[PDB]
Amino acid sequence: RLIYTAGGYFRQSLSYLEAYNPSNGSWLRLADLQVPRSGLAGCVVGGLLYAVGGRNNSPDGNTDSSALDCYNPMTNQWSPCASMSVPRNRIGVGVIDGHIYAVGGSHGCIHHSSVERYEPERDEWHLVAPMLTRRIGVGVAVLNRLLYAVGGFDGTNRLNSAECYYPERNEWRMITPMNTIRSGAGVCVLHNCIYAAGGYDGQDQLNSVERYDVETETWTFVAPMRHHRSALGITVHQGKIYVLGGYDGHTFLDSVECYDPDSDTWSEVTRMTSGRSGVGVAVTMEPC
């Protein structure tokens, strides 16, 4: 029912949790994160919203986060969960069969290839097989109970490469690379395709959008977004992609755009209450 945006960055890391309602255009401000964080990811398991990793960039210092925190819309409260094995800033996450996969990200100058999986029933993290590539600012999506890690930055180069994790083999394999180098792209799934929207290539923030068809193993460009943006939040709500904020090399954007795959068009839907980048985004039910 609602698109939740958690944390992000403008001047410093943010604690905001706000929920947008596509049905009426309204934004609600909800309970702040306990710790400000940018470069985190959001996901939903069993109706609960999780905020994963990131970094607190504050005037008092810069601290990468290994934190997992859970928001209950029914109570409007955040609860701490078990922390990850390592801090993971500029993280990507995916959910498969009620488990959260935390992928890549940085801890200071360490750019992680490691991956770990959270089991809400046990409140436990366990490492799984590492990716073949170190990736921070990595886009993650899940399609047909397979996990995809797309683009990012390896410590030296921004990447067009992507790879797939096969849970029952505990194994990563490269897939077809994207046609575009993208770090901090928005990555999501819609129908049978993984979409990669925007990002940064070391020179420019991008408006281009391409999608990987798992059946054909090829990437194809769709219509570009109205705004160039890196470190955007992205989610799917009722068969449409929504992209939230990000950075265009000039402004921390408040723009929210929506993609209709049937007309292959992007349109402006709303503005966030303030411009920000590096948010975590996910969809769950209305609070209380």
Ligand X SMILES: COc1cc([C@@H](CC(=O)O)c2ccc(C)c(CN3C[C@@H](C)Oc4ccccc4S3(=O)=O)c2)cc2nnn(C)c12
Of 37 and 227, which has the nearer Cβ to Cl ion?
37
Of 22 and 36, which has the nearer Cβ to ligand X?
36
Q: Is 185 exposed, middle or buried (0-12, 13-18, 19+ CB in 10 A)?
A: buried
Q: What is the DSSP letter of 136?
A: B
What are the tokens at 281?
Answer: 């985004």
**280 contributes a contact to ligand X by CB under 6 A:** no
**105 contributes a contact to ligand X by CB under 6 A:** no
> Which of the listed partners (Cl ion, ligand X, none) does 200 bind, with a CB threshold of 5 to 8 Å by partner kind?
ligand X
The closest alpha carbon to 272, from 14, 1, 12, belongs to: 14
CA distance 214 to 162: 12
**Of 41-80, which residues contact ligand X (CB under 6 A)?**
57
Of 110 and 129, which has the nearer Cβ to ligand X?
110
> Which of the listed partners (ligand X, Cl ion, none) does 183 bind, with a CB threshold of 5 to 8 Å by partner kind?
ligand X
- The least CB distance from residue 210 to ligand X, in Å, is 18
Cβ atoms of 226 and 210 closer than 8 Å? no
CA distance 5 to 15: 10
**Residue choice 4, 9, 212, 266 for contact with ligand X (CB under 6 A):** 9
**111 contributes a contact to ligand X by CB under 6 A:** no
- The least CB distance from residue 13 to Cl ion, in Å, is 9
CA distance 271 to 252: 12
- The least CB distance from residue 34 to Cl ion, in Å, is 19
